[PDB]
Amino acid sequence: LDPIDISIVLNKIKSQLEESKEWIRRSNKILDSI
Amino acid sequence: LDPIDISIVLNKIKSQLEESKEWIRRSNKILDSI
Amino acid sequence: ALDPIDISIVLNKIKSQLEESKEWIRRSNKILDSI
Amino acid sequence: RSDIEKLKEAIRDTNKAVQSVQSSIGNLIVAIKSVQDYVNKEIVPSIAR
Amino acid sequence: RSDIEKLKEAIRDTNKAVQSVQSSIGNLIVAIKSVQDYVNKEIVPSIAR
Amino acid sequence: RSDIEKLKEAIRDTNKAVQSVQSSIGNLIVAIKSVQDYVNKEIVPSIAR
Ligand SMILES: [Ca+2]
């Protein structure tokens, strides 16, 4: 049978997670300036 | 075999996710009032 | 002879991390109460 | 009405959004657990049979 | 920039971080649904035969 | 502490909650991939045989 392949969606989630982490990094950097 | 059916929980996740979206909407509009 | 799938370790970690997230919100809300 | 009270309410709303996400992640665990159980209790025996 | 302005932007970045998490969960639903559908459409028929 | 310092600590706590959620999602990905791989390497070849 053809294998299940959800790599497209998993790779998308990994990409959105990296974005989420960058925003939190930016938030904390601003808080550090206070 | 009986088919696997997790559509209820997945649509429940979709519901809780829309609630989360509205909470961010409110938060963003209060910050604008500053 | 097919081994059953067992992702219980990772699921239990996700659960613990979820409980850790609830604790951080608890603390946030508590500080906000003290304002 | 004060800026400090506005920030306070904003954070309070962000927290609620995060709480909703926490609930959603809890249900994702159940959904994935259900797939595991289905594979182990239905598909695996069927193939071993 | 003032302490109030800094706090307002901090919370704005945090909300964006939650918004990305929300997107992630949306796609986690899609991935799990795809596994469900693959099991139902490709595996169960095969096993029934 | 001041109101400003309190809002600040409230927002670090919230960010740490988001980070725990980020970690939890990362592991959700791992769990789903494990399911996919199990289907493709254990179930599918079995049915093929
Ligand atoms: Ca409040």
Nearest to E27 among A2, A13, A33 (CB): A13
Q: Does the distance separating the beta carbons of E3 and A34 come in below 8 Å?
A: yes
Resolution of the coordinates, Å? 1.8
Phi, psi of B5 (to 5 degrees): -135, 105
Q: Would you tell me how many other CB atoms lie within 10 Å of the CB of residue B29?
A: 11
Residue E10: partners with Cβ closer than 8 Å, 6 or more residues away: A27, A28, A30, A31, F8, F11
Domain residue ranges in chain E: 1-49
* Contact by Cβ (8 Å): D7, F3: no
Q: How far is CA F47 from CA B4, D34, D40, E34, F39, in A?
A: 18, 22, 15, 19, 10
Q: How far apart are the first and last CA of chain A?
A: 58
Decide: F1 and A34 in contact? Cβ < 8 Å. no
- Residues lying with their CB under 5 A of ligand 1, a single-atom ion: D 12
- CA-based nearest distance B28→chain E, Å: 7
Strands (E), A1-34: none
Structure tokens at B19: 């609630």
DSSP alpha helix (H) spans, F1-49: 3-38, 44-48
Picking from F33, E31, E47, the residue whose alpha carbon sits closest to that of residue D44 is E47
Counting Cα atoms < 13 Å in the Cβ hemisphere of E46 gives 17
Find out whether C4 and D41 touch, Cβ atoms under 8 Å: no
Residue C4: count of CB within 10 angstroms of its CB: 14
**In this structure, what DSSP letter does residue F1 have?**
-
CA distance C19 to chain D (A): 9
Is D47 in contact with E47 (CB distance < 8 Å)? yes
D8 alpha carbon – ligand 1 mean position (Å): 6
Q: Do E40 and B4 touch (CB under 8 A)?
A: yes
- Asked if E22 and D21 touch (Cβ cutoff 8 Å), the reply is yes
Distance CA D42, CA E1 (A): 62
Query: Is D9 in contact with B2 (Cβ distance < 8 A)?
Result: no
Contact (CB<8Å) F26/A4:
no
Asked if residue A4 lies in contact with residue E38, where contact means CB atoms within 8 angstroms, the answer is: yes
> For residue F16, how many other CB atoms are within 10 A of its CB?
19
Is the separation of the CB atoms in D24 and E28 below 8 Å?
no
Backbone φ and ψ for D2, nearest 5 degrees, come out as -75, 160
How far is the CA of D17 from the CAs of B3, B21, C22, E22, E36, in angstroms? 34, 7, 12, 9, 28
Closest CA to D33 of A32, F29, C7: C7
* Among the listed residues F33, D38, A7, the one whose alpha carbon sits nearest the alpha carbon of residue E43: D38
Using alpha carbons only, give the angle C7, C12, C13 rounded to the nearest 5 degrees.
100
Tokens of residue C1, six digits: 């002879």
What technique was this entry resolved by? Answer: X-ray
Identify the residue whose tokens are 């988001």: F18
**B31 vs E contacts (CB less than 8 Å):** 8, 11-12
For residues E26 and F30, give the distance between their C-alpha atoms in angstroms, rounded to a whole number.
Answer: 16
